[PDB]
DNA sequence: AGTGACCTTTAAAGGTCACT
DNA sequence: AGTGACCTTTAAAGGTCACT
């Protein structure tokens, strides 16, 4: 299951077995180089029910569990689907 | 282009860019743990035309170009299709 | 604008069988 | 029994768009 939020997970995404929602979130965050601010103490619990309630803490736990930014495509590799040789 | 025989090659197989024929040859050789003997000096040229005329020299150069035996599935992984998680 | 269930696209695995 | 053109299956990458 998903290491950052607990939802159901079929395979690994950007280094960690993740939910479909946390694949999309982590992917859009890095492409847009988004930057967030947590309205509370950076201790927001990130489970399936509270997942969207803080984008900072949800990205913070993304980096903590070990999702790697470099996997989302950048420079030459942007746009191509599937595995890269 | 296929590194062992020169035929056309679409992708990489067991570590080296190879044709379908040399993918199949290399895979069954290792599964059957086959062992060959070269009817001549072990210098037999392996191109597309003479490709099947000596299975030792074609296997000899197969390991030389650098395809690795471990990729074909053994023990736990025998029988399973596709990429491994 | 952001979300995420759903989809296509890849590299590369093995399985198949007319032909030899 | 051996070959190899062809097929299906894997994980995992991006793209979509009704819903919010
Ligand atoms: Zn998730
Ligand atoms: Zn927070
Ligand atoms: Zn070849
Ligand atoms: Zn020979």
UniProtKB/TrEMBL annotation, chains A, B:
Domain Nuclear receptor: start-end pairs: 1-74
UniProt subcellular location: Cytoplasm; Nucleus
Signal peptide extent: none
Subunit structure: Interacts with SFPQ, NCOR2, SIN3A and HADC1. The interaction with NCOR2 increases in the absence of PITX3. Interacts with PER2.
Family in the record: Belongs to the nuclear hormone receptor family.
Protein's recorded name: Nuclear receptor subfamily 4 group A member 2
Residues of the full protein shown: 262 to 346 of 598
